[PDB]
Design a protein around this motif. Sequence first.
Motif, PDB file in Angstrom:
ATOM      1  N   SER A   3       0.959  -1.274  -0.054  1.00  0.00           N
ATOM      2  CA  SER A   3      -0.426   0.071  -0.207  1.00  0.00           C
ATOM      3  C   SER A   3       0.844   0.691   0.238  1.00  0.00           C
ATOM      4  O   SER A   3       0.354   2.535  -0.339  1.00  0.00           O
ATOM      5  N   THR A   4       2.136   1.110   0.454  1.00  0.00           N
ATOM      6  CA  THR A   4       3.479   1.793   0.671  1.00  0.00           C
ATOM      7  C   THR A   4       4.533   1.471   0.114  1.00  0.00           C
ATOM      8  O   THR A   4       4.770   0.227   0.425  1.00  0.00           O
ATOM      9  N   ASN A   5       5.784   2.328   0.316  1.00  0.00           N
ATOM     10  CA  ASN A   5       7.108   1.885   0.620  1.00  0.00           C
ATOM     11  C   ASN A   5       7.758   1.183  -1.490  1.00  0.00           C
ATOM     12  O   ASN A   5       8.070   0.602  -1.407  1.00  0.00           O
ATOM     13  N   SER A   6       6.712   1.712  -2.364  1.00  0.00           N
ATOM     14  CA  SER A   6       7.122   2.002  -3.831  1.00  0.00           C
ATOM     15  C   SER A   6       7.583   3.525  -3.982  1.00  0.00           C
ATOM     16  O   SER A   6       6.613   3.788  -3.507  1.00  0.00           O
ATOM     17  N   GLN A   7       7.918   4.149  -4.994  1.00  0.00           N
ATOM     18  CA  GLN A   7       8.529   4.794  -5.399  1.00  0.00           C
ATOM     19  C   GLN A   7       8.471   4.782  -7.111  1.00  0.00           C
ATOM     20  O   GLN A   7       9.346   3.443  -7.136  1.00  0.00           O
ATOM     21  N   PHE A   8       8.613   5.566  -8.024  1.00  0.00           N
ATOM     22  CA  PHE A   8       9.408   5.846  -9.386  1.00  0.00           C
ATOM     23  C   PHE A   8       9.146   6.778  -9.655  1.00  0.00           C
ATOM     24  O   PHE A   8       8.320   7.994 -10.102  1.00  0.00           O
ATOM     25  N   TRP A   9      10.465   7.521  -9.501  1.00  0.00           N
ATOM     26  CA  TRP A   9      10.434   9.272 -10.066  1.00  0.00           C
ATOM     27  C   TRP A   9      12.713   8.631 -10.987  1.00  0.00           C
ATOM     28  O   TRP A   9      12.600   7.769 -10.248  1.00  0.00           O
ATOM     29  N   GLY A  10      12.806  10.034 -11.603  1.00  0.00           N
ATOM     30  CA  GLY A  10      13.883   9.576 -12.300  1.00  0.00           C
ATOM     31  C   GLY A  10      13.989   9.055 -13.124  1.00  0.00           C
ATOM     32  O   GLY A  10      15.055   8.710 -13.344  1.00  0.00           O
ATOM     33  N   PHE A  11      12.950   8.622 -14.434  1.00  0.00           N
ATOM     34  CA  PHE A  11      12.843   8.432 -15.235  1.00  0.00           C
ATOM     35  C   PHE A  11      13.599   8.729 -16.537  1.00  0.00           C
ATOM     36  O   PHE A  11      12.910  10.774 -16.028  1.00  0.00           O
TER      37      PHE A  11
ATOM     38  N   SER B  64      11.080   0.220  -2.860  1.00  0.00           N
ATOM     39  CA  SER B  64      11.625  -0.467  -4.038  1.00  0.00           C
ATOM     40  C   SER B  64      11.232   0.926  -4.788  1.00  0.00           C
ATOM     41  O   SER B  64      10.732   2.103  -4.748  1.00  0.00           O
ATOM     42  N   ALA B  65      12.882   1.270  -5.609  1.00  0.00           N
ATOM     43  CA  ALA B  65      12.958   2.194  -6.350  1.00  0.00           C
ATOM     44  C   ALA B  65      12.641   1.847  -7.806  1.00  0.00           C
ATOM     45  O   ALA B  65      12.679   2.645  -8.427  1.00  0.00           O
ATOM     46  N   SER B  66      11.951   0.795  -7.899  1.00  0.00           N
ATOM     47  CA  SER B  66      10.924   0.604  -9.440  1.00  0.00           C
ATOM     48  C   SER B  66      10.911  -1.247  -9.420  1.00  0.00           C
ATOM     49  O   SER B  66      11.520  -1.305  -8.700  1.00  0.00           O
ATOM     50  N   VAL B  67      10.366  -1.708  -9.904  1.00  0.00           N
ATOM     51  CA  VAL B  67       9.676  -3.296  -9.657  1.00  0.00           C
ATOM     52  C   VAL B  67      11.249  -3.789 -10.820  1.00  0.00           C
ATOM     53  O   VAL B  67      12.254  -5.290  -9.788  1.00  0.00           O
ATOM     54  N   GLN B  68      12.228  -3.597 -11.520  1.00  0.00           N
ATOM     55  CA  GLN B  68      13.451  -3.454 -11.759  1.00  0.00           C
ATOM     56  C   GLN B  68      14.584  -4.082 -10.382  1.00  0.00           C
ATOM     57  O   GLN B  68      15.473  -4.997 -10.784  1.00  0.00           O
ATOM     58  N   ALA B  69      14.628  -2.647  -9.302  1.00  0.00           N
ATOM     59  CA  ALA B  69      15.487  -2.671  -8.992  1.00  0.00           C
ATOM     60  C   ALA B  69      15.673  -3.824  -8.171  1.00  0.00           C
ATOM     61  O   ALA B  69      16.113  -4.547  -6.954  1.00  0.00           O
ATOM     62  N   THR B  70      14.215  -3.427  -7.289  1.00  0.00           N
ATOM     63  CA  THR B  70      13.034  -5.008  -6.300  1.00  0.00           C
ATOM     64  C   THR B  70      13.441  -6.032  -6.611  1.00  0.00           C
ATOM     65  O   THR B  70      14.441  -7.368  -6.052  1.00  0.00           O
ATOM     66  N   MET B  71      13.261  -6.789  -7.747  1.00  0.00           N
ATOM     67  CA  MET B  71      13.186  -7.970  -8.534  1.00  0.00           C
ATOM     68  C   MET B  71      14.535  -8.683  -9.069  1.00  0.00           C
ATOM     69  O   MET B  71      15.166  -9.451  -8.751  1.00  0.00           O
ATOM     70  N   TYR B  72      15.607  -7.484  -8.869  1.00  0.00           N
ATOM     71  CA  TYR B  72      17.178  -7.663  -9.198  1.00  0.00           C
ATOM     72  C   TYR B  72      17.403  -8.222  -7.259  1.00  0.00           C
ATOM     73  O   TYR B  72      17.933  -9.219  -7.568  1.00  0.00           O
ATOM     74  N   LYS B  73      17.154  -7.546  -6.171  1.00  0.00           N
ATOM     75  CA  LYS B  73      17.779  -7.352  -4.506  1.00  0.00           C
ATOM     76  C   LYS B  73      17.389  -9.691  -4.856  1.00  0.00           C
ATOM     77  O   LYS B  73      18.309 -10.427  -3.859  1.00  0.00           O
ATOM     78  N   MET B  74      16.077  -9.819  -5.311  1.00  0.00           N
ATOM     79  CA  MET B  74      15.283 -11.286  -4.871  1.00  0.00           C
ATOM     80  C   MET B  74      15.946 -12.021  -5.574  1.00  0.00           C
ATOM     81  O   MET B  74      16.843 -13.128  -4.548  1.00  0.00           O
ATOM     82  N   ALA B  75      16.878 -11.769  -6.876  1.00  0.00           N
ATOM     83  CA  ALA B  75      17.447 -13.078  -7.722  1.00  0.00           C
ATOM     84  C   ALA B  75      18.917 -13.179  -6.825  1.00  0.00           C
ATOM     85  O   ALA B  75      18.803 -14.470  -7.004  1.00  0.00           O
ATOM     86  N   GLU B  76      19.324 -11.860  -6.440  1.00  0.00           N
ATOM     87  CA  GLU B  76      20.685 -12.123  -6.018  1.00  0.00           C
ATOM     88  C   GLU B  76      20.837 -13.198  -4.574  1.00  0.00           C
ATOM     89  O   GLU B  76      21.989 -14.203  -4.737  1.00  0.00           O
TER      90      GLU B  76
ATOM     91  N   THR C  28      20.301  -3.466 -11.631  1.00  0.00           N
ATOM     92  CA  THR C  28      21.797  -3.552 -10.010  1.00  0.00           C
ATOM     93  C   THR C  28      21.792  -1.742  -9.382  1.00  0.00           C
ATOM     94  O   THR C  28      22.221  -1.725  -7.662  1.00  0.00           O
ATOM     95  N   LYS C  29      21.324  -0.953  -9.704  1.00  0.00           N
ATOM     96  CA  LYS C  29      21.900   0.578  -9.183  1.00  0.00           C
ATOM     97  C   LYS C  29      20.861   1.424  -9.317  1.00  0.00           C
ATOM     98  O   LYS C  29      20.960   2.560  -8.613  1.00  0.00           O
ATOM     99  N   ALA C  30      19.731   1.469  -9.384  1.00  0.00           N
ATOM    100  CA  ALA C  30      18.208   1.779  -8.728  1.00  0.00           C
ATOM    101  C   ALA C  30      18.335   3.155  -9.849  1.00  0.00           C
ATOM    102  O   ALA C  30      17.849   4.420  -9.416  1.00  0.00           O
ATOM    103  N   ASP C  31      18.952   2.306 -11.152  1.00  0.00           N
ATOM    104  CA  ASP C  31      19.188   4.391 -11.943  1.00  0.00           C
ATOM    105  C   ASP C  31      17.794   4.282 -12.813  1.00  0.00           C
ATOM    106  O   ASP C  31      18.021   3.450 -13.709  1.00  0.00           O
ATOM    107  N   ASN C  32      16.980   5.118 -12.418  1.00  0.00           N
ATOM    108  CA  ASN C  32      15.904   4.838 -13.410  1.00  0.00           C
ATOM    109  C   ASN C  32      16.054   5.271 -14.443  1.00  0.00           C
ATOM    110  O   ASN C  32      15.012   6.184 -15.634  1.00  0.00           O
TER     111      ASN C  32
END
Lengths: 295, 295, 295, 295
Positions: A154-162, A224-236, D47-51
């Motif tokens: 419901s919170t603690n997800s972000q998407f900016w700087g695209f 989460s900075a993004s879906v991208q950033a969060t899913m990567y942490k999972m895989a690692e 890898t670097k939360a770089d949007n």
Amino acid sequence: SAVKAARYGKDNVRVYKVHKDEKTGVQTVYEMTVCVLLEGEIETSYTKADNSVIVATDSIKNTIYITAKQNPVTPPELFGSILGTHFIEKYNHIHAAHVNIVCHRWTRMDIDGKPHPHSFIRDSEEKRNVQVDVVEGKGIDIKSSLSGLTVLKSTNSQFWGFLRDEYTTLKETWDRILSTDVDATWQWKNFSGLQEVRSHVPKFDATWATAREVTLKTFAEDNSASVQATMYKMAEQILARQQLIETVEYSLPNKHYFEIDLSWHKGLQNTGKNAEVFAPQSDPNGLIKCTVGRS
Amino acid sequence: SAVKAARYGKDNVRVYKVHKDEKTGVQTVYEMTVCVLLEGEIETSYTKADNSVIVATDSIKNTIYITAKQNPVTPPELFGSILGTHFIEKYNHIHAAHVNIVCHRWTRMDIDGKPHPHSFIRDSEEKRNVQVDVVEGKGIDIKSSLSGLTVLKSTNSQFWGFLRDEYTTLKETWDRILSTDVDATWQWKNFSGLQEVRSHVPKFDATWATAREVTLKTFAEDNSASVQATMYKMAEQILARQQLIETVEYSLPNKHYFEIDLSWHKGLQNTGKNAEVFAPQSDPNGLIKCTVGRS
Amino acid sequence: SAVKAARYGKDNVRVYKVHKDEKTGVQTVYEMTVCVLLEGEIETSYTKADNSVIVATDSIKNTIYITAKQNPVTPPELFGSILGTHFIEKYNHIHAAHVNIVCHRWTRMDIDGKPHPHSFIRDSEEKRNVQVDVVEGKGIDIKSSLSGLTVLKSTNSQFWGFLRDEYTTLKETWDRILSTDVDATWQWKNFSGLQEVRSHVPKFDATWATAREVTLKTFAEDNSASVQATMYKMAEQILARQQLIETVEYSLPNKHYFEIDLSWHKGLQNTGKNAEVFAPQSDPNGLIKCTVGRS
Amino acid sequence: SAVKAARYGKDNVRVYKVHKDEKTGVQTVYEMTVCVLLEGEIETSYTKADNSVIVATDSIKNTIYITAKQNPVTPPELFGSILGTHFIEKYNHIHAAHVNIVCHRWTRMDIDGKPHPHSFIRDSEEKRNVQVDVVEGKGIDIKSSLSGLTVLKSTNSQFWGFLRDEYTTLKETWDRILSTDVDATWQWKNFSGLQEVRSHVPKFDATWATAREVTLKTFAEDNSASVQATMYKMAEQILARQQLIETVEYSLPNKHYFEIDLSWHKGLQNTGKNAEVFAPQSDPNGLIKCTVGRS
Ligand SMILES: O=c1[nH]c(=O)c2nn[nH]c2[nH]1
Ligand SMILES: O=c1[nH]c(=O)c2nn[nH]c2[nH]1
Ligand SMILES: O=c1[nH]c(=O)c2nn[nH]c2[nH]1
Ligand SMILES: O=c1[nH]c(=O)c2nn[nH]c2[nH]1
Ligand SMILES: O=c1[nH]c(=O)c2nn[nH]c2[nH]1
Ligand SMILES: O=c1[nH]c(=O)c2nn[nH]c2[nH]1
Ligand SMILES: O=c1[nH]c(=O)c2nn[nH]c2[nH]1
Ligand SMILES: O=c1[nH]c(=O)c2nn[nH]c2[nH]1
Ligand SMILES: [Ar]
Ligand SMILES: [Ar]
Ligand SMILES: [Ar]
Ligand SMILES: [Ar]
Ligand SMILES: [Ar]
Ligand SMILES: [Ar]
Ligand SMILES: [Ar]
Ligand SMILES: [Ar]
Ligand code: NA
Ligand code: NA
Ligand code: NA
Ligand code: NA
């Protein structure tokens, strides 16, 4: 013209097995849906109407049920490996057996605090899956997955700087909903054959449970900075916790929950920090994919 | 020709709402799919192209999101009564509001045995539903249901002593799998209006939970003579436990699990007491309905 | 507690039947999905575990395939009446048979402008349905329907003059897309029994076809004021053309196609008269119902 | 750990475009569902939360609608190629654009023998699809397909002379039903880029129509030895009728229609030459795949 590739078999084979403990009276159920496709010297069945090279799809269906009778159906990595090996060994002209399995959830009911001996609930449409490719003189290639794990925060997800250009309308945000249906695959190191699969049996359930814990915990805790950033942490973390995994793949939809401007009505405030009521978007959806391996 | 009946409105309206406790920072999410249909003096919108009597489906959609902003979305019995009452009170020429709600599961994640403040999982496509008919001058008729509750038991189900004639092949059994998807509806005593619905709000969550417990327990524990006999036991328990219910209705499919005869293959034994591997049947399925009331 | 209502039987019974003309060698195929539920003196199967009053769901399944062997499966109004009548006549303690049928399309292929003798295509998931209630001593109530008929028109649909208040945002329009999935039911005059159904058999195919033609033509040609006004025109045409129909019922979703404002991008013009590219909306959707009878 | 593969974008983008002829008043509609996934220098987003390397999925959605506004949406091979080229050209760090398109059927209604200018029916769920992979300095790889073409033939299908061993129960037959949902793909010769795609535009619709004619005609006329033998004949003629196709792939399910033994009931004869009434099998199904190329 000539056949460059061919495979055939039985899809959508629904199987149930029960274990009944004579000692404790405790019963345990397994349910799955199986697909087996074979390759080999079968080109004349296409080019020359020669059915004499066909193990009928009907006989393949029979064989799935007979293998389940005579072998364990769990872990599904093992069952798949036994079933694919049977086909390349039994039949001289069959050189590969592709086995796909969806495992359905049957969770033991808790009744009045006590686990029930023979009652079960489907506590999610979440599946556990395997793809087992058994290739004569190349070994066994296993992909294990969970799919249909539906989550929302419901919170603690972000998407900016695209990137912003003449095509961009999306407002930057520092507080948003994030919902997904998790599809996560771990590709095992090539196995030399059935013997090596049997040698690693305890890793399969343990690795699946760890994949699931890491997915749930990372999603719940990551800002989460993004879906991208969060899913990567999972895989690692998954790669770090099992050396026999070569790659981890996430395929994650971003199932948008849109803010609703109600300010046109009595100046009702329902955006940014006042966002209470949202419109779940059925389509379209973001789709983010990533395969992670070792450096 | 004349209009004998009409209703119109918006179907499939996806709504999400979050509550954020300022002190604790615990967030709670609610997701539902809503349909509102209105009746009243609308005949002429059909017979004479008089749109002047239509509250546009778009406006009904807007009103659903606005009502959710201004009111609690739980219990859905209450939300549905509020929304229905709005339309018959707001508009003189609207005399009935039919409100259908499907509530989707968002269960709070436990992370390291600690309930997380803002992360959720869909544990099953099991729905809680309401159908609320608000009729000017007659009051509010509420039906409450749970649907998509999928359960199996591996033993302690029987079916013998059924009628036998030239149309019967089914073998009597003293031990079988029973599997179903529970549809269970409780019809409340008519309500005078919104006020009376409000006054009973503590009954809605409690009755839904005891409905669920009675379904799960009775299914787990009854050595079932038939679906018929087991579902009647559930209905009569729920009735006994909530005096404001007038009727209970189960609708239960019998999701067959067929024994497989393997004796044609190396004399393999997989029937009666030896029955281990089954073929789940997608179709056809037994369908068994019962409405139970007070004598 | 007591049983206020009960019915049970087999749902989702897939049936195919082929007719083979011996002279011509032309084959004709029929596919349908059937559900039969029985009522009668069955109370005790629920209250007292008395299976002696159950005609097993399995036997009802057997009887469906046997009835199809011995009788014509078309029109489905007839097939359903035969099947219902069987159960209330065969069994003294069965007093009502509820028969639901969904007919699947198998349209004969034209190959080189020549109708093929034994090849068929499913042209659309459009269904023809019947609901046949055979009630001992009251006769046979038949509802006939077409469903899943999916249509769009790009212009000659309007919606202006609807009520406007603090809940309205929808802009009036004199030119819009109209798209729907047609659900259309005609309720026949009660029948005395099977004999009377049989005597009217030539009306069933003809009424279904003129129902379809009137739906397709009226939709194509009406410069629609509203879904409401267009669906009323269809109902009153069908009524005028078949005197044995008592009521017609349309249930029509408004499958919205939203204009996209692109003027934010290089001043691109894609609204009102410039409207070229639209976003089809999966949900929500207008839902518009009307039952029309004789004045 | 490191990213070995990554792609992201917007899935399930529903698009409608209308062509309106000013001359004739004749309108034409196109509807499709689009997915665009991009690859390139985007690893730091994982890898670097770089949007800052992300063209937002929202902007990709915008771009699909803007491309449809400014370009033809037909043939879908062309639209896909324009849309994928835009992305690798606009954005320096984007090196591939994967574009998937499902085309939905909108067939002009015939009303009273005359084609209607602005009315359409969905005459099947049959789709026309493309996969367009636009890879910077590798060119454009197009796969074209039809899917969801559902067909059945009541005779002139055979399956005998297949391998029999201790796993085989299937009876040989010389007369059986054959039903399938056709999925057929033709893989085009690699294209150097958008210019070369535009150079072959007339081949796309013509090749699709020919693929469809050859599928329907072969299925209807072949006295099938097997699904294998019949699908091969289809691929060969397609390859022969278009030199720019490199491979043809069929994926065909065998949707079994089981004979019903009714001899246990009054000695009813419904097998072999007396087979009239059959049980369509939902699952399992045969699945037969084959890729055909040039010798
Ligand atoms: O056409 C067929 N191909 C097969 O491989 C097969 N196997 N069982 N039946 C079959 N039918
Ligand atoms: O209201 C909107 N909210 C969003 O988050 C969004 N993204 N694209 N378009 C949008 N519209
Ligand atoms: O045809 C229509 N009928 C309605 O009732 C409506 N409401 N919004 N749009 C509409 N269109
Ligand atoms: O294998 C079977 N199991 C069953 O329970 C059944 N019922 N009818 N036919 C059947 N076949
Ligand atoms: O529980 C059951 N009820 C029935 O009515 C029935 N009919 N066949 N099998 C059955 N099982
Ligand atoms: O773009 C839109 N088109 C519509 O027809 C509509 N109706 N409500 N909101 C809308 N937005
Ligand atoms: O998490 C996100 N990733 C993206 O790539 C994206 N694009 N729009 N919104 C987005 N959200
Ligand atoms: O009755 C049957 N018919 C079939 O064609 C078949 N194939 N496998 N099992 C079967 N049973
Ligand atoms: Ar199983
Ligand atoms: Ar995520
Ligand atoms: Ar909600
Ligand atoms: Ar039950
Ligand atoms: Ar049929
Ligand atoms: Ar309409
Ligand atoms: Ar389009
Ligand atoms: Ar075929
Ligand atoms: Na082999
Ligand atoms: Na009113
Ligand atoms: Na009777
Ligand atoms: Na580029």
